[PDB]
Design a protein around this ligand. Structure first.
Ligand SMILES: [Cu+2]
Ligand SMILES: [Cu+2]
Ligand SMILES: [Cu+2]
Lengths: 115, 118
């Protein structure tokens, strides 16, 4: 009834789509197990990009490592470890890493959006 | 529903003292609370040295990510240690609690469905 695990030990999946390059995803608590919402951990490589998109669901994010550039419907904002991010449903968002070291963030969404 | 995005340093949120029949030595920051959340809430808990959230269970799940320190997890039967970089999934109704057996603060994110409050 309880899972306790090192996130690093969860296998990181390379993500590659027309909008996503240089990103890896770990599914910590996935759709199958989740009553309501899922927990993922993203790694963005230097120069990596999750380009602007809208989703039907909100995001709740916590920046774990590095300087995360957040793309908005207009412009961008770079934040760092210790910031949280709440993206309303339907809002344009994306992410980039302009730095020379990997950026990591925790990302939770309602399970309707889980892989 | 609203549009937009909130980007905020977690430590800018006021750390509220939690004092109940089961909890001492704990502060909570509500990061994404009921005022905002479509479905689930995000809190950041700080457990001071010797702090305790005694065993309990709840009718909803917890999804936890340990940000800092070494946290003792209280289970139905026994205890287990985790540290920074561990995650915890607590099924609904499973007994769980926490204790800080170290001399430094432990911090963890704790997310619950919004039906459970903030
Ligand atoms: Cu159990
Ligand atoms: Cu998204
Ligand atoms: Cu609980």
């Amino acid at each position: 009834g309880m899972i306790l695990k090192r996130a690093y030990d969860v296998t990181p999946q390379k993500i590659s789509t027309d909008k996503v390059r240089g990103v890896r995803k770990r599914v910590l608590i996935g759709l199958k197990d989740a009553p309501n919402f899922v927990m993922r951990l993203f790694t963005v490589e230097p120069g990596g990009l999750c380009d602007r998109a809208s989703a039907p669901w909100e995001h709740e994010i916590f920046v774990l490592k590095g300087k995360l550039t957040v793309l908005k419907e207009q412009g961008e904002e770079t934040v760092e470890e210790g910031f949280y991010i709440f993206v309303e449903p339907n809002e344009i968002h994306g992410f980039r890493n302009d730095t020379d070291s990997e950026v990591e963030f925790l990302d939770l969404i309602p399970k309707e959006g889980g892989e």
